[PDB]
Amino acid sequence: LLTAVVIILTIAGNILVIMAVSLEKKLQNATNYFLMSLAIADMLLGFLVMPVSMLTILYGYRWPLPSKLCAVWIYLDVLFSTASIMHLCAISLDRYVAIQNPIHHSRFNSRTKAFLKIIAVWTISVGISMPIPVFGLQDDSKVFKEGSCLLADDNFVLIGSFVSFFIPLTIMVITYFLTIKSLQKQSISNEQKACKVLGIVFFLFVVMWCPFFITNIMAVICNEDVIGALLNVFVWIGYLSSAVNPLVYTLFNKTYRSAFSR
Numbered sequence: 001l002l003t004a005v006v007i008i009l010t011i012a013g014n015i016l017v018i019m020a021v022s023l024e025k026k027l028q029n030a031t032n033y034f035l036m037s038l039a040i041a042d043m044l045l046g047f048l049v050m051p052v053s054m055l056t057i058l059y060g061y062r063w064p065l066p067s068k069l070c071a072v073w074i075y076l077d078v079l080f081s082t083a084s085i086m087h088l089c090a091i092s093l094d095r096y097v098a099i100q101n102p103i104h105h106s107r108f109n110s111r112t113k114a115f116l117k118i119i120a121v122w123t124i125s126v127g128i129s130m131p132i133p134v135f136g137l138q139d140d141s142k143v144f145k146e147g148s149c150l151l152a153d154d155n156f157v158l159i160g161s162f163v164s165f166f167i168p169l170t171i172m173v174i175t176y177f178l179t180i181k182s183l184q185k186q187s188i189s190n191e192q193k194a195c196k197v198l199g200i201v202f203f204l205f206v207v208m209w210c211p212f213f214i215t216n217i218m219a220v221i222c223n224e225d226v227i228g229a230l231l232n233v234f235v236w237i238g239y240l241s242s243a244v245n246p247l248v249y250t251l252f253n254k255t256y257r258s259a260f261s262r
């Protein structure tokens with residue numbers, strides 16, 4: 001089965017990135033700490049949420065014995081997915097100011113800025129995910145449907161995606177446009193490599209996560225069986241981003257390539 005492969009890849013990649021950050025004195029800078037936070041969030045996603053999803057697949061999408069695990073499982077899934085998404089959004093926003101104003105960004109760059117960045121993204125992720133255990137356990141219908149564990153709150157699914165993958169998405173495309181504008185208008189080879197890396201990262205993020213959110217919104221604003229079957233695969237397409245984020249955010253460095261090979 002090609003789902004155990006996904007969980008193994010997620011765990012191994014995030015563990016290796018955390019090891020590379022921790023064991024190398026040359027990689028302890030303000031950006032790599034945020035990258036390690038991304039790795040931690042992706043590892044938690046791949047360890048706590050994904051194998052339970054494979055177990056749900058193995059039982060024909062019939063929940064295992066403890067019914068109380070559904071609401072907390074949805075909480076953890078949404079929390080870690082949002083944490084990854086606005087981690088990427090913060091990375092893009094930080095790169096825009098690093099490229100447009102390098103001197104001022106370096107002058108204002110500090111450990112305090114990185115800690116503020118981390119707490120800001122995690123605080124927004126916590127605020128977005130807040131109602132799920134408050135109301136998911138108060139009413140079992142909001143987290144169950146036809147005997148399968150899935151959230152069935154139409155209003156939250158519509159607005160809760162409008163501040164998780166559509167306002168962050170608008171920010172990310174605007175930032176991508178402004179950065180490719182900035183990097184183009186001996187030192188040009190570095191800028192070309194940076195533009196290529198930014199394009200690969202942005203387009204992979206969009207192509208992996210956008211299908212799931214698009215069909216999720218289409219399942220509410222609008223077929224039901226087809227859309228559900230599509231969601232069942234697109235959620236794992238999105239989960240695979242946790243196994244792709246470390247490799248595309250770290251392996252372009254020779255230090256990370258050497259550490260992975262050690």
Ligand SMILES: CN(C)CCc1c[nH]c2cccc(O)c12
Nearest residue numbers: 077078081082156157160161164
């Ligand atoms: C299913 N899982 C990949 C979580 C994705 C998610 C992030 N934020 C949300 C807000 C509402 C409904 C959701 O599925 C989400």
